[PDB]
């Protein structure tokens, strides 16, 4: 039959209805007084967490990250700029809020590397995402077949190179077909046209 996890996963399909909504309205209050990068002891979304790589092991860390809601906090051009490049309000970044979160976090925990991330709500002026990090210098993980690879040197500061899962999704590398002409194998080797 259905696992206990499948309940949590279903509840989160509509975070505005039922018990979860009654929960969000509560926590969020306590969440708004909390700092930007806070280390929590256990995943809010246990299912998603596990389904992303989570494990109750030594060297596996989770954390919530709050970011201001909005569009390009872009300063207006000071020198001569033609009508088209005269934007400040409308234009938005080419990097999604979730990815910004992953970085603020990886930085906060220098030595740790980023496994994955996931949304955990949002109100009228901020969005929250939890982050799974791993300590690639801890024998538990160096010995764990299922996470071992994250220790590889060429995995260091991966979130910053866009190597996340949320990264490749942002880079337009989902479909192996139509549309990916300008994105595979990388944006820079395609002249940045996506």
């Amino acid at each position: 039959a259905r696992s206990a996890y499948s309940y949590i996963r279903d509840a989160w399909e509509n975070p505005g209805d039922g018990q979860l909504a009654e929960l969000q309205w509560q926590r969020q209050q306590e969440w708004r007084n909390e700092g930007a990068v806070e280390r929590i002891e256990r995943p809010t979304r246990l299912d998603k967490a596990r389904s992303q790589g989570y494990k109750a092991k030594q060297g596996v860390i989770v954390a919530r990250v709050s970011v201001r809601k909005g569009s390009a906090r872009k300063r207006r051009h000071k020198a001569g700029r033609r009508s088209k490049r005269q934007g400040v309000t409308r234009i938005t970044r080419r990097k999604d809020i979730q990815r910004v979160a992953e970085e603020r976090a990886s930085r906060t925990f220098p030595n740790l590397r980023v496994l994955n991330s996931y949304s955990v709500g949002q109100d009228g002026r901020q969005k929250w995402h939890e982050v799974i990090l791993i300590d690639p210098n801890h024998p538990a993980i160096q010995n764990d077949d299922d996470l071992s690879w994250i220790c590889a040197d060429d995995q260091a500061d991966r979130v910053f190179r866009g190597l996340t899962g949320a990264g490749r999704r942002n880079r337009g590398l989902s479909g192996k077909g139509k549309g990916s002409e300008k994105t595979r194998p990388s944006l820079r080797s395609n002249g940045g046209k996506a």
Binding site: R2, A4, Y7, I8, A11, E22, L23, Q26, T44
Partner: protein
């Protein structure tokens, strides 16, 4: 808190855990929320235990409604490690299950009733 729709007095609570200990030595108990949840669906459960100090709550919110549409009686426990320890574990447990008790099928039944009256 949100799934907790009633308060369980300390003594009644003590009685539940006492029974859980002899049950783990005579009958059968299930540790952890996954195993416990599966019982309520398989029907092989008689009495379920749910800690009140669970964070994040989601891990448990489903128990109350799921057990009620399957008839299976339940109970709220304050501590986590008390349920965890009581089930013969060194850790703690969000929820445990009474899959066919032992030497207390009477006590268990009565307890499940006192709760039925506790609303």
């Amino acid at each position: 808190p949100v799934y907790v729709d009633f308060d369980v007095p300390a003594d009644l609570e003590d009685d539940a855990l006492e029974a859980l200990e002899v049950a783990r030595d005579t009958g059968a108990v299930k540790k952890g929320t996954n195993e416990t949840t599966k019982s309520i669906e398989r029907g092989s459960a008689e009495l379920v235990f749910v800690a009140e100090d669970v964070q994040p709550e989601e891990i448990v919110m489903h128990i109350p409604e799921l057990a009620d549409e399957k008839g299976v009686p339940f109970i709220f426990v304050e501590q986590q490690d008390d349920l965890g320890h009581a089930a013969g574990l060194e850790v703690g447990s969000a929820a445990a299950a009474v899959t066919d008790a032992g030497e207390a099928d009477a006590d268990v039944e009565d307890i499940a009733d006192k709760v039925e009256e506790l609303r």
